[PDB]
């Protein structure tokens, strides 16, 4: 029906993220329709687990006239680290809450940095607790600080919408402040562009399996992540070895022959001129020249704690774990940031990885870190090298 957008509140503890979330649901419900949620519901964050990693996360939903929002909110800075690196949803945009009284604080900076590292494309600022501040000059100063901070991490500080509001007053029914929640909603609508639907993006299919079908040749199977592959189209085979070219000479689903395969569908793609031996675990079919193989990259990683089922001991420079991208492990070596000799269970670090075989990747690609099958960490490619 409507574009689905992933958003969430970020910023320092006690600046009013949870209150703002409650106020957004409430104000949009009574204006546009929906179900209002209350501070104490959202504040009481349920614990969720995905492959060992425990995160206290609250999920709410709200609607504007044109868009539907899945909105994430977390109690602790520890959860934001985990959620941003390894969480289910990747954010299309974040709302940075900064309390007008305090101004920018350490976690304000950390979340902006993390935002950049994990590829959070857009940030909008809600300048909160403006009911506690009457001197307009001070609001301007706090705003300028935030704009500066955002620019430091390559966000367009000068151009980022900043809304002067009060989450509490708006949650309590003050129409004058509820108007500011609506201004924020407008910026979500207007400033975060409509998310590209997978079908519209360049074709990509991670290869899960391979067969030689009698009287046709080599078929590669998987789910179409993005785009459309049609019979006759050229495709590249990227990863593990030098990229290969071929033509799609068929798309099968179960027993039905199709002229194309679309994002979301599990299909078998027949490849002209390609042997079964020329297909390796970890490769993707891609629209020619739309995704490149890389061996070395910069990453933000979270290392599982003892409790989460991770390592007991810490690792050092000479650590060579399995890096799980899409379908398969690939061994790699690491380089740690200056003045770091060690990494403990539960730490998160910037980490430069060098893979032994290349993998098709762009910035934003998620991965797990494994030791003989068992997940010991998780991460996201921050910059390809
Ligand atoms: N005066 C005022 N207080 C607020 C506002 N928003 C939140 N608070 C208060 O700040 C405290 C922390 O808010 P909370 O939403 O829990 O912050 P979080 O730690 O970022 O989730 C609570 O006592 C709120 O009532 C506001 O706009 N004005
Ligand atoms: C949870 C699975 C990994 N795991 N779990 N418990 N310990 C480990 N890893 C190691 O012991 C280890 C052994 C030799 C060298 C190094 Cl660098 C690390
Ligand atoms: Mg909170």
Numbering used by the authors: 8 to 392
Task: Copy out sentences from the published article reporting this entry, exactly as the authors wrote them.
EF-Tu is an essential and universally conserved GTPase that is critical for protein synthesis. EF-Tu delivers aminoacyl-tRNAs (aa-tRNA) to the ribosomal aminoacyl (A) site during the elongation step of translation. During trans-translation, EF-Tu delivers alanyl-tmRNA-SmpB to the empty ribosomal A site. Domains 2 (amino acids 209–299) and 3 (amino acids 301–393) together bind aa-tRNA; domain 3 also interacts with EF-Ts to promote nucleotide exchange.
